Symmetry: C2
Amino acid sequence: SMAFKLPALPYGMRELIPHISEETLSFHYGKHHAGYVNKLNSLIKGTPMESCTIEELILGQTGAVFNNAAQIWNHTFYWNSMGPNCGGEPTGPIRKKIEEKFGSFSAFKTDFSNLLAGHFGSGWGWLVLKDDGTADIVQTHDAGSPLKENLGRPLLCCDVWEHAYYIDYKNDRLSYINSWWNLVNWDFANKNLEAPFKWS
Amino acid sequence: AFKLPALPYGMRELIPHISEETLSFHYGKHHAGYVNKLNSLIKGTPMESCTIEELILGQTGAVFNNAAQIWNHTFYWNSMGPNCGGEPTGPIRKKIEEKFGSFSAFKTDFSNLLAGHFGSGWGWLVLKDDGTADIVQTHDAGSPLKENLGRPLLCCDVWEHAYYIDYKNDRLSYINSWWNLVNWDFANKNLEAPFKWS
Ligand SMILES: [Fe+3]
Ligand SMILES: [Fe+3]
C-alpha cells in the first residue's frame, strides 16, 4: 500500500494531564488527526498524487488535498512541540534565539500568547527560524502552512482550532494557552534548529 | 451601546438536539462576548451610533468580525426552535421544492454543504434576487449581507463551538440534530421581509 500512515503519538494519551486531558488527546489525535490521514488517502487513491511526499502535496496542491495534507503535517508537528516533563524555561540554542529576538523568555511568552489568543477563527501559531537566522512568531489560518507560505522554518507550533481545547477549557482559549506553556518541548525546537523537521 | 438580544426560548428547550450546556456557552459566553467586544471597540468613536448592519457593511477587521458574529448568532437562534423541525411548511416549502425538487434532496444538498465546510463558518438558506431559493456558505464571520449572496432565510453555525460539547468531532450528527430544530416559521417571515437585527 502507498497510503499515508498516521505517525504514532510521542506519548500515551494520559501523559499531558492536567494540561491537556486524555479525552482531548483521544479525540484530537484519534479522531481529527486520524481523520485527516484517512481523508487524504481517499482523495489521492489511484491518482498520480499517490506517490507524492506530504511536503510535495502541501507545496503543489490546492483545495481539499492541500487542506488534509497540511493538517496531517501541522498536527504531527504539534504533538512533537509538546511533551510530558517539558515546559518551563527554554534551554540550549533556542533560549539564545528567543533572547536575541524578544529580549527575554517572558517577552516571548507575552507576544506568542497574545498572537495565539488573538487569532480569529481556526488556525495555528508558530515559532519559526527566518532566513536571516533570527527567530520570529507567525500565524496561519485554517490549514495554512509555513512551508507553503514560506514564513520560515517551523520550530514549534500551537493549535488554536477550537477542538484543540474545547473539551478541557470550552471558550477559555487563554487558559489553554497558559497550560500549553507547561507542555512546550524545547528539545523539539532545538532539533528543528539543527535541521528542518521532515514528516515521516 | 449594543445589547445581546434574548434567546427566543429557554436554555433547556432545544434538548435533546442541543444541550443546556451548549446554549450556556454558545449564547452566554461566545455571543455575549461578541457584544462586549464590539462595544469596547466602538466606544468613544464615530462608529458608536452605527447600526449593526451598518458596521457589517462598512467596516473590516475586528469591528466587522464582532458585528457580523453578533448578527449571525441572533439569526442562528431564530433559525431554530422547540416543537419545530420536520418537513418545511408555507411559502418556503414551495421555493424549496421548486429549486431542489424535494425536501429530501434539499436536506442532502444542504447537509453536504454544512458537512463539507472546512474550518469555522456558516451555512445559509437564502432568497436570491431572481426570487429563487439557494444555499451558500460563509467563512469565519462572513456575512451574506456583505458578500451579497442573497437574503438570509435560515442559517446553521458550523464553528466547532456550536457542537463540540454535544457531538465532539461528529459534525454530521450535529447537522442531523439541527434538522430537528429548524424553524420554518422564521424562514417564512424572512420571505415576507428581510430580518432586521434588534
Ligand atoms: Fe487540531
Ligand atoms: Fe457560534
